[PDB]
Amino acid sequence: GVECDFSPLLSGTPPQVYNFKRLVFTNCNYNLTKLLSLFSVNDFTCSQISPAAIASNCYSSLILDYFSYPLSMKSDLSVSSAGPISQFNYKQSFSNPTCLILATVPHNLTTITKPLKYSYINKCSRLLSDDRTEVPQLVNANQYSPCVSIVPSTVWEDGDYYRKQLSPLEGGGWLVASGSTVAMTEQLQMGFGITVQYGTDTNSVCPKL
Ligand SMILES: *[C@@H]1O[C@H](CO)[C@@H](O[C@@H]2O[C@H](CO)[C@@H](O)[C@H](O)[C@H]2NC(C)=O)[C@H](O)[C@H]1NC(C)=O
Numbered sequence: 230g231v232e233c234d235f236s237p238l239l240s241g242t243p244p245q246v247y248n249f250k251r252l253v254f255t256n257c258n259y260n261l262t263k264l265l266s267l268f269s270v271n272d273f274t275c276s277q278i279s280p281a282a283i284a285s286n287c288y289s290s291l292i293l294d295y296f297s298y299p300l301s302m303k304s305d306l307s308v309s310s311a312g313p314i315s316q317f318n319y320k321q322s323f324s325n326p327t328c329l330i331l332a333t334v335p336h337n338l339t340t341i342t343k344p345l346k347y348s349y350i351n352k353c354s355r356l357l358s359d360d361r362t363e364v365p366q367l368v369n370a371n372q373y374s375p376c377v378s379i380v381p382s383t384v385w386e387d388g389d390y391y392r393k394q395l396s397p398l399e400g401g402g403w404l405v406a407s408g409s410t411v412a413m414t415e416q417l418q419m420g421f422g423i424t425v426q427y428g429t430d431t432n433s434v435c436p437k438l
């Protein structure tokens with residue numbers, strides 16, 4: 230069989246967390262250890278699987294999400310934290326095994342370029358018709374924030390805010406968001422989210438033996 234193609238991850242400027250890029254793999258062979266050996270891995274944690282198991286099992290699919298992400302914001306990735314990252318930007322499946330990897334890009338990994346800064350959504354909210362009540366708009370597993378329609382791929386200025394008037398068909402009211410920025414680090418720091426699914430006789434994403 231053919232090798233899983235991880236090259237988009239290694240090519241060009243990775244998106245910000247709320248614009249995470251998604252790679253989907255079926256029917257291919259992988260070597261996770263080899264992929265990760267290109268990076269300096271700072272954190273590698275999983276739910277319903279382990280770092281050793283995720284590198285050595287056969288799956289019906291493997292999903293890999295990737296983005297620029299400052300290591301300083303480690304804690305904001307957890308569901309248990311009610312931080313803006315897990316609330317408004319990026320959420321992994323709660324029903325399939327997952328891993329989250331935080332890594333630093335070495336200088337000798339040249340095909341990856343730095344963005345100007347890190348950006349994230351600090352707030353995504355709906356104003357109701359009473360013009361008073363704001364309802365947080367929590368990102369769903371496997372989806373973008375509804376606010377990706379109004380927040381640009383790079384936040385221009387820390388504290389910028391954004392609104393969209395919604396149609397009766399969309400439930401009326403206003404979608405409202407605010408963006409934050411974090412200074413670029415000496416070396417680019419990234420997050421990788423891996424989600425796996427197991428099937429019956431379709432477990433064809435397998436490690437290189
Ligand atoms: C998958 O990739 C890993 C990492 O490149 C391979 O293990 C390394 O390669 C050689 C194998 O002779 C060892 O000497 C190193 O100590 C290993 N770790 C490194 C380089 O970090 C591994 O062989 C590959 N697995 C398969 C099944 O091909």
Ligand SMILES: *[C@@H]1O[C@H](CO)[C@@H](O[C@@H]2O[C@H](CO)[C@@H](O)[C@H](O)[C@H]2NC(C)=O)[C@H](O)[C@H]1NC(C)=O
Pocket residue numbers: 266267268269270335336337
């Ligand atoms: C490219 O950069 C990598 C990433 O840091 C270098 O690998 C490191 O080498 C040092 C010692 O030389 C180790 O202590 C680190 O643990 C290594 N990093 C990783 C992620 O394994 C590597 O030496 C450089 N390679 C080239 C060809 O320049």
